[PDB]
Design a binder for this molecule. Structure first.
Ligand SMILES: O=C(Nc1cccc(-c2nnn[nH]2)c1)c1cccc(Br)c1
Ligand SMILES: O=C(Nc1cccc(-c2nnn[nH]2)c1)c1cccc(Br)c1
Ligand SMILES: O=C(Nc1cccc(-c2nnn[nH]2)c1)c1cccc(Br)c1
Ligand SMILES: O=C(Nc1cccc(-c2nnn[nH]2)c1)c1cccc(Br)c1
Ligand SMILES: O=C(Nc1cccc(-c2nnn[nH]2)c1)c1cccc(Br)c1
Ligand SMILES: O=C(Nc1cccc(-c2nnn[nH]2)c1)c1cccc(Br)c1
Length: 260
């Protein structure tokens, strides 16, 4: 029923839809193209911010370290960083900017802190994610070209990783709590996964988008009276200039929630 429903949604959408749910009540999963690769776009900002949180476990002042923002550092979406050009932002500020505002300049500083995209990938491998790969910086990591393995993961892998980071033991308890608080404070998510969930429920999420109408969201969800869920919804379309479809992610999440 749920599989058939997600297939129906996909066919009507004209794109390719990827879904992974983990229900932590009983370790049940629901996968739809769970092992196909999709461009992550800004959902990758979670892995970068989490990597810096991991570093902060052994450098308890790391999040207070200032980082210079120069004019030439600004890229294509800098709602927070543009306010600080010719000044500085701390790594905590850059983390919150990247997660909660989806600031691309902030993400670049997180990547640089980790020694480049490969350091983010290395963190993913260290926590048992063999699938995630970050290959580029912002903004080009969002080109989302069909078939391109760069800056991709699978829904199954990303759901597992988001669970380990937010509900498991990938991070220390303080760092886990900080990540959760950041995600729950997201500003960009009301039209995506969370639009398809009951309004009683609480959640944190990280959205992404790019070329090929790519429209993504990953979420940790606390349903009324139930153990938490982790839900990944990835969507991408066959034409480079396709419009975003946050509604399709909301629809997928509604199918999932009604199936619980
Ligand atoms: O900045 C965004 N989009 C963006 C920025 C810069 C360039 C383009 C773009 N160029 N060509 N097609 N899209 C899109 C964006 C999209 C969705 C949510 C949030 Br938060 C930010
Ligand atoms: O803790 C880490 N790595 C670590 C520690 C012990 C073992 C392993 C490991 N084994 N196989 N792959 N990684 C990794 C680590 C790695 C890269 C970035 C960041 Br941030 C943290
Ligand atoms: O040719 C490509 N990339 C590319 C872009 C820019 C320059 C070059 C290049 N320069 N010299 N040889 N190749 C190649 C390409 C083809 C199919 C899928 C994808 Br993703 C990329
Ligand atoms: O399995 C997990 N947690 C967990 C905790 C306590 C008990 C069990 C359990 N008991 N029996 N089977 N699993 C699992 C877990 C937590 C975070 C990320 C990922 Br991937 C998996
Ligand atoms: O960076 C891009 N967009 C963008 C930037 C910042 C945030 C977001 C975003 N956040 N949440 N959902 N989308 C998207 C983008 C879009 C199309 C082509 C290329 Br190349 C880059
Ligand atoms: O991109 C727009 N809006 C918008 C607002 C919030 C989120 C997104 C979005 N999120 N993910 N992909 N697009 C787009 C927009 C609105 C009016 C005119 C023009 Br041109 C562009």
């Amino acid at each position: 029923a749920v599989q058939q429903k997600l297939a129906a949604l996909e066919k009507s959408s004209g794109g390719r839809l990827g879904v992974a749910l983990i229900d932590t009540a009983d370790n049940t999963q629901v996968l739809y193209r769970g092992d196909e690769r999709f461009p992550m776009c800004s959902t990758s900002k979670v892995m970068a911010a989490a990597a810096v949180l991991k570093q902060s476990e052994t450098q308890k002042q790391l999040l207070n370290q200032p980082v210079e923002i120069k004019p030439a550092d600004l890229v294509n979406y800098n709602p927070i960083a543009e306010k600080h050009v010719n000044g500085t932002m701390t790594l905590a500020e850059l983390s919150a900017a990247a997660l909660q505002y989806s600031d691309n300049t902030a993400m670049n500083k997180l990547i640089a802190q980790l020694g480049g995209p490969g350091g983010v990938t290395a963190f993913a491998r260290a926590i048992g994610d063999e699938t995630f790969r970050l290959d580029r910086t912002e903004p080009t990591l969002n080109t989302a070209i069909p078939g391109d393995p760069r800056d991709t993961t699978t829904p199954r892998a990303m759901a597992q990783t988001l669970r380990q980071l937010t509900l498991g033991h990938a991070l220390g308890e303080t760092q886990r709590a900080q990540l959760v608080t950041w995600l729950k404070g997201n500003t960009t998510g009301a039209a995506s996964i969370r639009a398809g969930l009951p309004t009683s429920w609480t959640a944190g999420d990280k959205t992404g988008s790019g070329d090929y109408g790519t429209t993504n969201d990953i979420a940790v969800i606390w349903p009324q009276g139930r153990a938490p869920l982790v839900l990944v919804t990835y969507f991408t379309q066959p034409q480079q200039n396709a419009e975003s479809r946050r509604d399709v992610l909301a629809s997928a999440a509604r199918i999932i929630a009604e199936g619980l």
